[PDB]
Amino acid sequence: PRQHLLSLTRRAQKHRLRELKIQVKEFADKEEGGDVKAVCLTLFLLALRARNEHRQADELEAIMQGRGSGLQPAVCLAIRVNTFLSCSQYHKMYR
């Protein structure tokens, strides 16, 4: 009995979308170079802007570009150094 897509587990969702996975990967590496993740997030942003949710698309662009809700290692290194944090104290703080 079918219930819903996101109600399944990871392996079950993979079993259910293996066909679309193969199709998208082949039709993306035929002509579009082969970057599967690129075509994936591009199609997702397009389907999301179809619902004109500018906010969600901007947040996803920020996440996938590293500029919000998550720091690149250089910035947190500068924070760990310029604030005189130790390696164990930063660890506790990060733990």
Q: Which of 22, 63, 77, 81 binds another protein (CB under 8 A)?
A: 63
Q: Which two structure tokens, joined as six digits, stand for 35?
A: 């970057």
Nearer to DNA, 72 or 82 (CB): 82
Q: CB under 5 to 8 A by kind: which of DNA, another protein, none does 30 bind?
A: none
Rounded CA-CA distance 33/27 in Å is: 10
H-helix segments, the chain: 10-29, 36-49, 54-65, 73-82, 87-94
**Span interacting with DNA, options 30-38, 46-54, 58-66, 70-78, rule CB under 7 A:** 46-54
